[PDB]
Amino acid sequence: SSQIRQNYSTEVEAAVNRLVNLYLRASYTYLSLGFYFDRDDVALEGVCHFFRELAEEKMEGAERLLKMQNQRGGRALFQDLQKPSQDEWGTTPDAMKAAIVLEKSLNQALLDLHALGSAQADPHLCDFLESHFLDEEVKLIKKMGDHLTNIQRLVGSQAGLGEYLFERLTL
Amino acid sequence: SSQIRQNYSTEVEAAVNRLVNLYLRASYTYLSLGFYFDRDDVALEGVCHFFRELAEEKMEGAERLLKMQNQRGGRALFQDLQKPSQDEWGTTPDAMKAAIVLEKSLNQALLDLHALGSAQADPHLCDFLESHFLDEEVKLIKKMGDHLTNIQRLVGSQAGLGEYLFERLTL
Amino acid sequence: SSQIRQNYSTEVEAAVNRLVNLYLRASYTYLSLGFYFDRDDVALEGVCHFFRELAEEKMEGAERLLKMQNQRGGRALFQDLQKPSQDEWGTTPDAMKAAIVLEKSLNQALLDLHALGSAQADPHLCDFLESHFLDEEVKLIKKMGDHLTNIQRLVGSQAGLGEYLFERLTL
Amino acid sequence: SSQIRQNYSTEVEAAVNRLVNLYLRASYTYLSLGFYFDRDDVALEGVCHFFRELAEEKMEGAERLLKMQNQRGGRALFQDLQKPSQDEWGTTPDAMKAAIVLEKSLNQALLDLHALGSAQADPHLCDFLESHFLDEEVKLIKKMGDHLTNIQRLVGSQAGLGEYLFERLTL
Amino acid sequence: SSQIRQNYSTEVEAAVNRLVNLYLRASYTYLSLGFYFDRDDVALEGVCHFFRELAEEKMEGAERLLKMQNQRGGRALFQDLQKPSQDEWGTTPDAMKAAIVLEKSLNQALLDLHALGSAQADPHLCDFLESHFLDEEVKLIKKMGDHLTNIQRLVGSQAGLGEYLFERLTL
Amino acid sequence: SSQIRQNYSTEVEAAVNRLVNLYLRASYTYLSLGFYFDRDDVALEGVCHFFRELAEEKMEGAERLLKMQNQRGGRALFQDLQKPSQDEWGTTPDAMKAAIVLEKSLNQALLDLHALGSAQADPHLCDFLESHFLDEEVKLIKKMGDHLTNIQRLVGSQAGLGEYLFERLTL
């Protein structure tokens, strides 16, 4: 029995492990999305950079969750990482929609975990998630939504031209 | 059919994809090894740092392989990542032995791939692997072997004392 | 008989002379491509600069080959330089396709020479080509393929507008 | 018909194209002269450097002519480049004599072109040639003549010693 | 049995030990050549410095080979060092010829070792030799050949004068 | 007969040549001792560095002796270098004892040579040895004796632990 563990439920410990898996898998998805936009027959460098930076941020989220698990006296447990949902990611709007779907699923897991900690009366967990995760998610999702609106407006006009202009002038 | 692909076999393309998977899985193993040494009941910060730095280096290897795949006109394909072989990693000597086993398996995949490129008369592949991978592996494995010899010499004497001294004065 | 020559075949010496000719002729082609984009009725300065820089790089390749020929004790022999294949180079996509064709032909001569040195057991030649030529070619061809994909996407939409935008925002 | 072309004869346009060819071929000759003095059995580094620098200057002359052709609304047209007149260039005095012969032939083509522009009442051409070409030629030829006199004086005495001393102390 | 050794043949291990001996003996030869040119009745300081610097470079080669032997898990084994082939080294041309003979013998041992590693499918060895040894040898031998040609040209004229001039103005 | 030689006996000249051989052989011994401590199964980096630095110092001693031989008008003569007395050097205390034995043998050769110069009334030799060799030896031997006492005290307690601590905290 842990020499430091206090007010830390087995349910929260398990939930944090699942969330690590979800962050790792999102990182993997972004690695894939990034290298797809690096293909010579896709060739949108700004889009590649966008998603590769997101891969690093998700990996950072997982590491932060793992650090907290140990701080609280929980034990990190890792599961297999399922490969990303697609091998090819279509056009800029397809990939940005996919990204928002992924982020919304992360945000919901965060929200579920926050509801669990609140039901378990775990204020440290609730402060940890609010400080480092919940606002970062809101801000990123807003940014993605802004990007989708701009991409959609551009590719309604002329699809190839619009995609090029967005990568050049926004990304 | 790729506008840039030249002298790049389907066998090498497939082999490079498998090697990416192997590097990603090694990264995952090192993340696990690192956070285990971060546990309040293990508490060897130098050892944690050692393995967490290795996680970053393996992730860097995977990214470099993916970049080359695209440079050559191959298509990156990702598979599921199997979880690390253990959930708990025992003592410093156990973990360092595990690390050498893992690295030796990476080095053999690199050697196999180099033999394949040589049989396919792919000099770019052979130069790529020699420049960025084969010497890094030799140097890392030597470093690990040096570490194991020092840890074994220390924990033969007095196991807890020896483990502490190694983490403090070498790592 | 040369006071320094060792392990350097007459076949490799001849092949290196042919490759110098091929590099010189590529330089000439790029000079032509560059000044065509400088015409008042073509007027794409970024495209001119792209090809004029490539003319300098190919001339650098020839000089490096000549320096090695002398280092090894071979004798540089020069042949007539055939003029470039066209007098006028059409549109940006036409010129970029022509460039990829030229580079792919250079890369194949490099690959052939590397196979010859390997059959002659000439490791210095094989290291020389890998270090200074084979990776530069792979990277340049990837860059060109990226450019073609972007130009094609732009000129599918609206050809003049697309060509202008590419020269302004990528080149 | 060119939107910018004014007072620019078809005869001058053709003459400028021939002169580009002559400058390119002189550059080629100097590349050859330079790498000959780089041979392990010739080994006069100052002489190599002399001629390799001249190769760059002649290439610069060709580029300047091509730029002016486009400025005036003429169309650059390239022809085959004949290889240099020799494969081996003998002694320092032989090579310096060859250089003066080549430069005198360039200067005469410049003089002929200036006489053509003057007969065509093309003052821009006449100013262009005077500013960038005619005085550079006079100064270079004087320099070469100075060098020949010094080399001849030295190799009259003792030929190998004299050649070494000139390369060391003048070049 | 070595905890790190992988893909490293007993034949290569033995060959590397022989090459260390060959590098050490070359260092010894250059020490001798250097101090001979330091004699009050020889007195060519530039020549002394030339060979003493080469003694240091050969010692560096031996150390680099020994470091790699240990990196790979081989065991360094040292043999007696035979004294240099001469006690007195004649004139500058005699000593430079002797140096080229020695270097050509080193280069052939390197080439033989590279052929052995290639037959043993040891790509690390092959990359190690190419990176640090084979090009250094080619460049040094070219330099020596250049020096011999210059010395021979000078001492054909007037032997003492020529030897002095070479030491003063080249070395 | 030497234009500079004065008060320099054939006996001293011969003795200085023998001492050069002894210094060279000590250098060789230290190279061996150094690379043994570099082995992955020995792995004491401080000890390696200690002996490799001593190899350089002994090589410096030999060079200084050779320089003086020439200053005095003597002729350097080199003999075969016998390999070091062991291929493997045991533990830190074994190697430090071996080092003291070697240094004591060098110091005795220096003392013998000083007694010879004094019997030959060669004050320059006697001052040369006192200034650059005799005090360096006394200081090095004291340092080694200090090291042995510390190593012996440590490995009396717990041998592996003690050896590690000495390499970490003294070397």
Chain A residues whose beta carbon lies within 8 Å of the beta carbon of residue B77: 87
Contacts of C68 (CB under 8 A, 6+ apart): C16, C128
Contacts of C25 (CB under 8 A, 6+ apart): C81, C82, C84
Q: Which of E136, E8, E19, E7 is nearest to E66 (CA)?
A: E19
Total domains in chain D come to 1
Q: Residues E150, D43: contact at Cβ < 8 Å?
A: yes
Say which DSSP state B133 is in. I
Distance from C-alpha of E8 to C-alpha of E74, rounded to nearest angstrom: 8
Chains A and E share 3 or more Cβ pairs within 8 Å: no
CB-based burial, D99-126: b 16+ in 10 Å, e otherwise: beebbeebbebbeebbebbeebebeebb
Chain B residues whose beta carbon lies within 8 Å of the beta carbon of residue E128: 135
Q: Which chains touch B (3 or more CB pairs under 8 A)?
A: A, C, E, F
Distance from C-alpha of E65 to C-alpha of E110, rounded to nearest angstrom: 11
Distance from C-alpha of E26 to C-alpha of E106, rounded to nearest angstrom: 8
Chain D residues whose beta carbon lies within 8 Å of the beta carbon of residue E46: none
F70 touches chain E (CB under 8 A): yes
Which residue on chain E is closest to B148 by alpha carbon?
Answer: E3
Nearest to E135 among C70, C73, C127 (CB): C127
Provide the β-strand partners of residue E81.
F81
Cα distances (Å, whole numbers) of residue B54 to A24, A81, B50, B139, D4: 17, 19, 6, 13, 64
* Backbone dihedral region for residue F72 (phi beyond 0: left; psi -120 to 50: alpha; all else: beta): alpha
Provide the β-strand partners of residue C109.
none
Experimental technique, in short, is X-ray
Say which DSSP state C73 is in. T
Cβ–Cβ gap A43/C145 under 8 Å: yes
Amino acid at site F62: A
Which residue on chain C is closest to E148 by alpha carbon?
Answer: C3
List the single best residue of E1, E2, E3 to mutate versus B (max B Cβ within 10 A): E3
Contacts of A38 (CB under 8 A, 6+ apart): A45, A48, B66, B67, B70
Provide the β-strand partners of residue B81.
A81
Number of neighbours of residue A45 by Cβ within 10 angstroms: 16
Resolution (A): 1.9
Burial class, E145, CB count within 10 angstroms (exposed 0-12 / middle 13-18 / buried 19+)? buried
Alpha-carbon distance F76 to nearest alpha carbon in chain E (angstroms): 8
Q: How far apart are the first and last CA of chain E?
A: 50
Which residue on chain B is closest to F41 by alpha carbon?
Answer: B149
Q: Residues B106, B23: contact at Cβ < 8 Å?
A: yes
Distance from C-alpha of C166 to C-alpha of F72, rounded to nearest angstrom: 77
Which residue on chain F is closest to B165 by alpha carbon?
Answer: F165
Amino acid at site A123: P
Q: Residues C54, C99: contact at Cβ < 8 Å?
A: yes
Cβ–Cβ gap C115/B127 under 8 Å: no
Q: Which residue intervals of chain A are DSSP H helices? A: 10-37, 45-72, 92-119, 123-129, 135-157, 159-169
Chain F residues whose beta carbon lies within 8 Å of the beta carbon of residue E63: 31
Q: Residue E1: CA atoms inside 13 Å, Cβ hemisphere, count? A: 2
Distance from C-alpha of E122 to C-alpha of B111, rounded to nearest angstrom: 8
Tokens (6 digits) for C77: 């022999």
Size of interface B-E (CB pairs under 8 A): 42
Chain B residues whose beta carbon lies within 8 Å of the beta carbon of residue C129: 123
C71 touches chain E (CB under 8 A): yes
Q: Residue D131: CA atoms inside 13 Å, Cβ hemisphere, count? A: 9
Which residue on chain D is closest to E165 by alpha carbon?
Answer: D165
- What is the distance, to the nearest Å, from the Cα of residue A118 to the centroid of all Cα atoms in its chain? 23
Distance from C-alpha of A45 to C-alpha of A171, rounded to nearest angstrom: 9
Alpha-carbon distance D169 to nearest alpha carbon in chain C (angstroms): 24
- Give the range of the structural domain holding residue D73, as residue numbers without chain letter: 1-171
Cβ–Cβ gap E32/F87 under 8 Å: no
Grouping H, G, I as helix, E, B as strand and the rest as coil, residue B151 is helix
Q: Residues C76, C62: contact at Cβ < 8 Å?
A: no
Cβ–Cβ gap E78/F32 under 8 Å: yes
A97-102 long-range contacts (CB < 8 A, ≥24 apart) are A97/A148, A98/A29, A98/A33, A99/A30, A99/A33, A99/A51, A99/A54, A99/A144, A100/A141, A100/A144, A100/A145, A100/A148, A102/A26, A102/A29
Q: Is A63 annotated as a binding residue?
A: yes
Cα distances (Å, whole numbers) of residue E105 to A112, E27, E144, F55: 74, 13, 14, 26
Q: Residues A76, A20: contact at Cβ < 8 Å?
A: yes
Tokens (6 digits) for E90: 């004649």
Residue F77: CATH number of its domain: 1.20.1260.10
Distance from C-alpha of B163 to C-alpha of B161, rounded to nearest angstrom: 6
A163-168 long-range contacts (CB < 8 A, ≥24 apart) are A163/A44, A163/A91, A163/A92, A163/C153, A164/A44, A164/C150, A164/C153, A164/C154, A164/C165, A164/C166, A164/C169, A165/C165, A166/A92, A167/A44, A167/A45, A167/A46, A167/A47, A167/A92, A168/A46, A168/C169, A168/C170
Cα distances (Å, whole numbers) of residue F90 to A127, C139, E28, F95, F98: 59, 52, 29, 7, 10
DSSP secondary structure string, D83-142?
PPS-S---SHHHHHHHHHHHHHHHHHHHHHHHHHHHHTT-HHHHHHHIIIIIHHHHHHHH
- What is the distance, to the nearest Å, from the Cα of residue F147 to the centroid of all Cα atoms in its chain? 16
Cα distances (Å, whole numbers) of residue C46 to B146, C154, C169, D111: 54, 16, 9, 35
Alpha-carbon distance E147 to nearest alpha carbon in chain C (angstroms): 11
Tokens (6 digits) for C31: 């000079």
